[PDB]
Design a binder for this molecule. Structure first.
Ligand SMILES: N[C@@H](CCC(=O)O)C(=O)O
Ligand SMILES: N[C@@H](CCC(=O)O)C(=O)O
Ligand SMILES: [Mg+2]
Ligand SMILES: [Mg+2]
Lengths: 246, 249
């Protein structure tokens, strides 16, 4: 089994600080990518990043309720109350760039897709639903997970990239659990898919030595019941297996 | 030299509507600072994982402390009192993993709950309330105190000669912190007592005949490990064992 590192978030739980990761991301690595998920703590520069990269066969940058701090893309200060995770930002943004340069497969989901865009020099809309023209991409409030993570808008694959290459249909439906989204696309990123309002919702890293894909939706959700989500996780898993085989 | 990849056991926690796997920052920083390793957190996924693949992927394992308690059915103990904190998903991960790791020669360090896991995994039992048995001190942390006091040294620890701790050179007595309501009752077969609290409670064990480093301690040596040499020595010994395994990669 390939060793797939999964990014942690930080959280104070009672008296103590913790590093946490969502069960559903870990189960998707097992059930969809065929990998062994181990959680990468959000320790930033305290860890030798190069040693961390040498030790994993791929990286999953997970979603999170928190938001990339806008200073990393020279954005406007966030509204009071906005959730941030500075320790995660300090870990993931340098890790993305280093992983892609070293040829470690990368899959970014939701916040992790936003991280990929910011890490390569792009910017975000902090409230897509207040921009105008764009849909409200947030999940419905006061609903169970099954409703929040159900398919809610279409997704239009752009030919000639990773998603077309794995054989996804030209249009398929995706879930949508995000209040932020891509504003300026980072240089060197290929657009892989667009929402029907034109929002960029998937990207790949041009010229990357290994699999390097980010998606704005949440394909870890019940991955075995969605052939499109599963196809993405299986392609990521194959790339990780390639690395593990060395 | 290859930094050893040290797996650190997670606990489960429901946060809102989502289940999470969690691990304490102070354990992870002790792996970096004290053992010289790269910590990755092992989810509490039980049988959903190929345990053999997990063992092949790590150079050592740290079984962490936790507020939760091993479920007493695993040592045929009486049902726990109402409200006792348990983590059945962690138990389903760690008890088989301990045995398999030591059988395969993967270095193991167990701290507090993780030391209790080691004793239970090999067939031993626990006292669910050490402070109520009658012959032990109260080994829990003091109630209305901040962490720096709760995790400070609070009782002595007496090394039993001839084992891992004496081999590390630790003194015959040293002070340790104490943040635990449970403790060893019956030692498991195949375990060597390494140290006793002054009341006689077994607070450290090693596995007889293990191919590789296999140590559990009931105190919490991750706490401020860098400035406590008696704690640091344990993490340094663990880290050296993990590095030996990494060198066979
Ligand atoms: N907080 C970010 C990421 C969401 C997520 O990963 O679920 C947003 O609202 O877009
Ligand atoms: N809950 C267990 C373990 C404590 C801990 O690991 O901190 C006890 O009270 O003994
Ligand atoms: Mg959307
Ligand atoms: Mg004690």
């Amino acid at each position: 089994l390939p060793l797939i590192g999964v990014t942690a978030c930080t959280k104070q739980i009672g008296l103590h600080p913790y590093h946490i990761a969502g069960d559903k991301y870990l189960r998707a690595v097992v059930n969809g990518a065929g990998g062994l998920p181990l959680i990468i703590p959000a320790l930033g520069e305290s860890i030798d990043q190069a040693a961390l990269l040498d030790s994993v066969d791929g990286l999953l940058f997970t979603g999170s309720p928190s938001n990339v701090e806008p200073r990393h893309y020279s954005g406007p200060a966030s509204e009071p109350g906005t959730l941030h995770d500075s320790d995660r930002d300090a870990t993931t943004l340098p890790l993305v760039r280093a992983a892609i340069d070293a040829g470690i497969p990368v899959l970014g989901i939701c916040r992790g897709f936003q991280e990929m865009n910011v890490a390569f020099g792009g910017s975000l809309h902090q409230k897509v639903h207040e921009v105008g023209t764009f849909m409200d991409h947030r999940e419905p409030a006061d609903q169970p997970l099954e409703v929040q993570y159900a398919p809610r808008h279409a997704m239009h694959v752009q030919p000639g990239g990773v998603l077309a290459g794995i054989g996804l249909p030209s249009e398929f439906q995706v879930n949508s659990i995000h209040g932020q989204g891509v504003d300026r696309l980072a240089p060197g990123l290929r657009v892989e898919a667009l929402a029907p309002d034109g929002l960029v919702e998937a990207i790949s890293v041009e010229g990357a030595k290994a699999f390097a894909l980010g998606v704005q939706w949440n394909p870890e959700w019940q991955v075995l019941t969605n052939p499109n989500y599963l196809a993405i996780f299986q392609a990521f898993g194959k790339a990780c297996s390639k690395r593990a085989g060395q």
